[PDB]
Amino acid sequence: ARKFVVGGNWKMNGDKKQINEIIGFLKSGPLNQDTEVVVGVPAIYLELVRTCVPASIGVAAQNCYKVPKGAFTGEISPAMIKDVGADWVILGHSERRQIFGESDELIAEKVCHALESGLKVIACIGETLEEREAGKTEEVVFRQTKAIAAKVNDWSNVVIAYEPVWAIGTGKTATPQQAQDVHKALRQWICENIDAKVGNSIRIQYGGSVTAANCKELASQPDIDGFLVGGASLKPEFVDIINARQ
Amino acid sequence: ARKFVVGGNWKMNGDKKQINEIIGFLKSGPLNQDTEVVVGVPAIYLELVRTCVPASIGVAAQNCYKVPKGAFTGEISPAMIKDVGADWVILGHSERRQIFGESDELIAEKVCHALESGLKVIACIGETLEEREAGKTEEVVFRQTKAIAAKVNDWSNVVIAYEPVWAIGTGKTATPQQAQDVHKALRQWICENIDAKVGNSIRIQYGGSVTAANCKELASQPDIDGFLVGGASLKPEFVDIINARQLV
């Protein structure tokens, strides 16, 4: 079976104090034994967080570049991430794709390099509202996935996160069924386009609004293997989400 | 006068081993006391460098965003930079403008926010070869500078670094005179469009190729107040650059 994976993407939030609070939640709160937990933190705190968090819990960078080193002011590489002990990296997040304009190709190259460098990756994909309403959900997620797949040969250390970007500003989030529909269509695409074994073993996290109230129904969907939590990851509620399967 | 300022931009380079070797260069190397020294490091080692580097040397982040916190995965804020004790941030570097497409206005907003957050800033500007050949050197640097000026009211903690981006892949770098021609023109623009005192006191670093072989002649230029160093900042050579203005 696919191990349930819950990632906490802190985004651009945090400081020493706040981090001690958040790590207090993980250490404290009861954690499900069958849940792989990953925490995505700002680069400035990667080493600190990696030292204060149990070896069982993954620590992820929120981004990285495609080469070990180079004339790329403001970027960090997988080698640096590994240098401080971090073992995960979040790539292709919608905020980076849209606000910072990273392309499918760049994301693909980044995923490839991260994996080859020894990092576990959470690659994000997702369609916007205009894309969905234009009935291009599948077209969009298949294109983003296809780009990554073009540079990835081994998916064992990859976790895909689906971000229902279209829901933002909508007034209502995606329904558990809508989320499920996307996950199953994506898994199907992976089975037919990459490999049936990969499709059956790859974890696909739901990357929309996950809270204590909806995490359980969301977690019970056949093709949802976890979450890439946003705001909730900063609160104790993150523990409740980690135990959505309970 | 304007205090000589030398910044070392490591860019995307470094690890614990390499950082200890570079901090070694800085610690042993006889550093001129009249030079303000700053070192720009990858965010991952921001706190690490600040704890190992002497309080006299400034530790800069290589970039930051324009708000204290938010839904900006992969970005860091001045609030975080300060939380680990760093006091500087390099913004608007040519690689971020050209490779990552940061706009003149985003740069200005970041500079404004960084300054307001209590950080000192090395704001970068510079024209490409296309722009220079098309005769837009002044047009570009003034435009980039003007955008930042629209969001800055206090220039005390700002250091401008001019990057002769046009010199890459050309075979030869900018000559000291060519560098001086831009620096002077920018200073003049600042005195006219911002303020006389600001223009006269604002440090303008040369962010082109700076080595131990060309630092002295460059630092001799009337309007060059230091350097934003690239490659050489990862080697002992950085010290010689820092001591570009020492007679012996």
> What is the rounded CA–CA span in Å between residue A164 and residue A179?
8
Kindly give the pairing relationship between strand B88-91 and strand B120-125.
parallel
Angle between helices B137-149 and B104-116 (to 10 degrees): 40
Residues whose CB is less than 8 angstroms from the CB of residue A86 and which lie 6 or more positions away in sequence, other chains included: A46, A47, A50, A59, A60, A61, A119
Give the Cα-Cα-Cα angle A86, A91, A92 (nearest 5 degrees). 170
**Contact A147/A188 with Cβ under 8 angstroms?**
no
Residues whose CB is less than 8 angstroms from the CB of residue B70 and which lie 6 or more positions away in sequence, other chains included: A11, A12, A13
Chain breaks in chain A (C to N over 2.5 A) after: none
> Residue B181 region, left (φ>0) first, then alpha (ψ -120 to 50), else beta?
alpha
Residues whose CB is less than 8 angstroms from the CB of residue A107 and which lie 6 or more positions away in sequence, other chains included: A91, A92, A97, A123, A144, A147, A148
To one decimal, the resolution in angstroms is: 2.0
Chain breaks in chain B (C to N over 2.5 A) after: none
Chain B contact for A168, CB < 8 A? Answer: no
Give the A:B interface size as CB pairs under 8 Å: 128
Question: Of B203, B201, B212, B202, whose CA–CA distance to B241 is shortest?
Answer: B212
Chain A contact for B89, CB < 8 A? Answer: no
Alpha-carbon distance A50 to nearest alpha carbon in chain B (angstroms): 12
Q: By CB neighbour count within 10 A (0-12 exposed, 13-18 middle, 19+ buried), where does A82 fall? A: middle
Domain A1-246 has CATH 3.20.20.70: yes
HSE-up of residue B189 (Cα within 13 Å, Cβ side): 18
- For chain B, count helices (H), then strands (E): 11, 8
Task: Give me the CATH code for the B1-248 domain, please.
Answer: 3.20.20.70
Give which of B9, B17, B73, B121 to mutate to test A binding, by max A Cβ within 10 Å: B73
Question: Of A217, A186, A43, whose CA–CA distance to B76 is shortest?
Answer: A43
Question: Annotated active-site positions of B, please?
Answer: 93, 163
Strand partners, A88: A60, A120
Taking CA atoms, B34 is separated from A240, B49, B80, B242, B244, in Å, by: 57, 22, 30, 10, 11
Chain B contact for A233, CB < 8 A? Answer: no
Experimental technique of record? X-ray
Residues of B in contact with A98 (CB under 8 A): none
Q: Do B101 and A101 touch (CB under 8 A)?
A: yes
Token pair 């640097």: residue:
B141
Residue B54 DSSP symbol: -
